Amino acid sequence: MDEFEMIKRNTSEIISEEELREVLKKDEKSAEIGFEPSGKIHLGHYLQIKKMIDLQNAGFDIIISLADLGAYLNQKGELDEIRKIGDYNKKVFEAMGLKAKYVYGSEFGLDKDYTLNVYRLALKTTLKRARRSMELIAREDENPKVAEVIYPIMQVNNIHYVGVDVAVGGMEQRKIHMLARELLPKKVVCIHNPVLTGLDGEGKMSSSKGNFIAVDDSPEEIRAKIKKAYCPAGVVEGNPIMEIAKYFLEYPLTIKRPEKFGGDLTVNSYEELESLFKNKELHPMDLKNAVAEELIKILEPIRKRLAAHH
Template identity: 55%
Template structure:
C-alpha cells in the first residue's frame, strides 16, 4: 500500500486529520504506533465501532495499534467505583477484539501504568495549564454539572498518556478534539513530539440526539441480538424525507455503503417492489418522499444484523 492509498483509506469517514502532511511523514517510517483511548463505562456500540474501523485502517497501513482502556479517567469522570469500572473494562476489551482487530493489537489498562514518575509529569504539565483551559477541554466529555478538580486532571493525564504510550497518532471522537489540541500545544514544551490527531464523527443516537451513548440508552450494541437490533432501529428517529441528522441514514452510510456499492430494499409489489440503489439514489428518493421510513428501517436492520453477526458469535463464545 503506497502512502496516498494509505491516506485515502485512513481518512475515510473521518471528520479531520491534524495534520495530513505530518501523517504522510509518519507513514514513511518502519515503526509507527497509533492509539485510541476509551472510558470503560457501558456497552460498546456502533459509535465506538466507527473508531475501531479507523484503527483497522491504520493497522493495514503498518501501524502498531494500542487500545487504552482508561479506567482511572472513567473514575475521575464519575463513571462508577474503580471495581465496577474495571469489571466493565474486561467486557469492553473483549468487545473490541470482537470487532476484528488483529491479534497483535495491544490492550492497556490505565491503572496498570500508574507510577510516581507518571504523576510527577502530570504535576509538571499542570503548572502550565490553566483551570479554564482544562475545563474547556472537558466540555463535551464530563458528565458533571458542577466542576471539580478531577476535570482539570483528566485532560492533562490524557495528554501524557500519548507520551507515556510512545504513540505517533492519537485517534478519538470529535468530543476529544479539545483535549488532543491541548496535547499538541503542551507536549512540545517538554521536548515531546506533538501527535497527529485523527477525529471521528459522532453518530447520532437512535433517538435523534447528537451522540450515540450507552448512558442515554440510544445505542445499538455490537453484541445486541437480532431482535433487539430490529426493535431499536424500528423505534429510531427517522423523519420522512429528511436525510440530514437522520440516524438510520447514518447507519446506512457508515455500515452498509462502506462495503456495498448498492443497497437492496425489499418490499411488496403493491408498495413499488424491490429497489437496488446506490447511496446517492437512496438519498434522492428518500428526500423526495418516495421511500417510506419503515422500508428504510427494515432494510437497514437486516444489513446491521448481518454485519454484527461475527461480533455476536465472538462474544457468545468468549
C-alpha cells in the same frame, strides 16, 4: 486509493494531513485511541474501531487504552468496577476482528515517573484551558470538582506514555488533543471521527435506553430499536438511520420491498440511497427494515464470537 485517502475516509478531520503523510513514510508507526470503559459497546464505538482497523491495514501498530483511571476521574464509579467493565470491553474489541495491544490507564498511570509528569503538566496548564477542554466530555457540574481538571492532563500524559504517532478519537476529544499538541515534545497527528447521532435523534449515541445499537444486541432488539428510531421521511440531516447506512452498510445493496410502492430496490451506493430518501421514493419504513437486516448481518460475526467464548 492510497493509504492516506483510505484513512481519511469517513473522518471529520486530520490534524494535520501533511503530518500524516510524513507519518505514513515511516517503517514503524503506531496509533492509539482511548475508551473510558462502557457497559455497552455500541455503533459509536464500532465506528472508531473500524478506523483503527483501517490504520492497522495501513501498517500501524494499534494500541487501545482502556481508560479506567480516566473514567474514575470522570466520576464513573469505583476502580474495581470500572476495571471489570474494561475487561469486558477488551473482549468486545477483540471480537471485532481488531489486532491490537490493550493497556489500562492504571497499568502505568500510577507510577512515580508518570505522576510526577502529571504534576509537571499541571504546572503548565491553565485552569481555564483544562475546563474548556472538558466541555464536550463531562456533564458540566453545578460546582465542578478538581478531578475534572486533572482528567485532561492525565489523558495528555497517557498519550505521551503510550507513544503513538497518531491519536484517534471522536470530535469531542479535539480540545484535549490540541492541548496534547501544545504540551508534549512530540506532536501527535490527530484523527477525529464524526459523532454518531443516537437513535432518539437527540445528541450522540449513548447507553441511554433505546438510544444505541449494541454490537452484541440480539436481532429482535436491533429490529425493535431501529423501528422506533428517529427517522422523518425525506430528512437526511441528523437522521441516525441514514448515518448508519452511510457508515456501516455495504453497497451495492438490495432493499426488500413488497409490491405496492415496490419492489426490491437496488441501491448502488450510499449516495444513491440518499437521493432516493430525500425525494421520498424510499419511505422510512423500508429504509429501517433494510438497515435492521443489514446491521444484523454486519454485527452477527461479533455477537457469535462473543457468545462462543466460555
